[PDB]
């Protein structure tokens, strides 16, 4: 804003005279074209959900899975250039394994968050690479409870109560905010699942032209014993029915 930083936006890791890196902000524009994804921190866990656009009926349903697991206890979902997202998850898997190998205990969530962050910011350091074209929502359970994070193309990340990214992010954030206001005492994991389905459904009105498929996962002390699991079967359908009623 000057959205276009003429003369300073032609290569990564260049500071504009106002101290911006335009390539990183451009990488953000690609993230904003992606499908909506969200995360909800709940009482003893975290829930993930993503909008999957049915571009053609030729897509085979329930294939083309977007949510990924890292180690056994961490989920990742991202919006934007999906292959950048897999690339980042591959790195996270090595970092996790490497931590677990020296220290034996599974990588704690804030520790995992910073491994991804440093790697992502390392890609804003040199003109020989470009920034990641994804924002990533991720987290899980550790010895300190549930943690949920969002990580941007700059390498910036913070912990969240709820997180949304992608095309329908403004709508989703609004519902995430109502949710927060309405639940000072907390949100059960099962509740968060249903509420997550509703939110993805509302956000979809931005991509209303195309059909979509809902994908949901969670990690919860009481529901999955702190392991990452995909929400499936009845619980899934129950959330789908609930979302639709609204």
């Amino acid at each position: 804003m000057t959205s276009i930083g003429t003369g300073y936006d032609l290569s990564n890791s260049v500071f504009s005279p106002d101290g911006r890196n335009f390539q990183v902000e451009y990488a953000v524009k690609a993230v904003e074209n992606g499908t909506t994804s969200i995360g909800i921190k709940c009482n003893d866990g975290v829930v993930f959900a993503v909008e999957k656009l049915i571009t053609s009926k030729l897509l085979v349903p329930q294939k083309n899975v977007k949510i990924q697991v890292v180690d056994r206890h961490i989920g990742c979902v991202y919006s934007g250039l999906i292959p950048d997202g897999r690339h980042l998850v591959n790195r996270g898997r090595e970092e996790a394994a490497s931590f677990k190998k020296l220290y034996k205990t599974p990588i704690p969530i804030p520790a995992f968050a910073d491994r991804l962050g440093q790697y992502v910011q390392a890609h804003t350091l040199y003109n020989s690479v470009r920034p990641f074209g994804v924002s990533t929502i991720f987290g899980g359970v550790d010895k300190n409870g549930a943690h949920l994070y969002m990580l941007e193309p700059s390498g910036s990340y913070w912990g969240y109560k709820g997180a949304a990214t992608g095309k329908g992010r403004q709508s989703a954030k609004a519902e995430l905010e109502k949710l927060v206001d309405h639940h000072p005492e907390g949100l059960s994991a099962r509740e968060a699942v249903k509420q997550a389905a509703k939110i993805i459904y509302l956000a979809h009105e931005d991509n209303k032209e195309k059909d979509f498929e809902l994908e949901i996962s969670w990690c919860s002390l009481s529901e999955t014993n702190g392991l990452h699991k995909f929400v499936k079967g009845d619980l899934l359908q129950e959330a789908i029915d609930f979302a639709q009623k609204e």
Binding site: S11, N12, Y26
Partner: protein
């Protein structure tokens, strides 16, 4: 005009967050000739139209076996296709030697994705400018995948890529309900495929010289039909 400033390498976002070098790579596929993939629950099939340079030349192979239960078809840069299919052959082989395990098609797609992705994020090289249709038969049944220059791999019932491929792709959407049910009937799945690719012909006809067909399925290893082997379907 503005695009001209941001499309120099794959390491540069445009102000709307496009990577034009990857978008241009997609266009390389349209310079290839059409190929179709489709499947039921028992078999997966590829159909390709092969080109010749003139009447004195051979027609160029479009279908490459990667293992007993997996192969692909290509449209776009021939060298790229050679590089990526050799890579797949190696990954299948690695899976067999170390694990005594056939590489799942879904896992093949992921490995392919990650390799192509790297070419899109670092200076020095270029995205792969070729499209791949991958068929296979593993423990979870029959599969068809489409590979894009961006690295993105998608699982589909059917699709078409290359020049004039829209016709076949429309025909496959239109016939979807029917071809996915062709089980235990490989010649019929092939007929559907030939019919689909036919929708992409412009004043040209399928011959024993230009038509290539591949099939894999339950109890059916990846097999490539060319020459007189394709006549029954013409």
């Amino acid at each position: 005009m503005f695009r001209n400033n941001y499309d120099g390498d794959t390491v540069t976002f445009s102000p709307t967050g496009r990577l034009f070098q990857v978008e241009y790579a997609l266009e390389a596929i349209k310079q290839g000739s059409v190929t179709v993939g489709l499947r039921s629950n028992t078999h997966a099939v590829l159909v390709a139209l092969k080109r010749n340079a003139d009447e004195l030349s051979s027609y160029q192979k479009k279908i490459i076996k990667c293992d007993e239960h997996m192969g692909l078809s290509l449209a776009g840069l021939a060298p790229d296709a050679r590089v990526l299919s050799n890579y797949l052959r190696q990954q299948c082989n690695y899976s067999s030697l170390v694990f005594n395990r056939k590489l799942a098609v879904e896992r093949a797609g992921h490995l392919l994705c990650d390799k192509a992705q790297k070419n899109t994020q670092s200076y020095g090289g270029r995205p792969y400018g070729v499209g791949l249709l991958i068929i296979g038969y593993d423990k979870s049944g029959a599969h068809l995948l489409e590979f894009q220059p961006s690295g993105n791999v998608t699982e589909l019932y059917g699709t078409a890529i290359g020049a004039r491929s829209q016709g076949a792709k429309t025909y496959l959407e239109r016939t979807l309900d029917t071809f996915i049910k062709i089980d235990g009937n490989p010649d019929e799945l092939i007929k559907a495929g030939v019919e689909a690719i036919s929708q992409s012909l412009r004043d040209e006809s399928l011959t024993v010289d230009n038509l290539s067909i591949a099939i894999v399925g339950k109890d059916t290893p990846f097999t490539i039909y060319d020459g007189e082997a394709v006549a029954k379907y013409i």
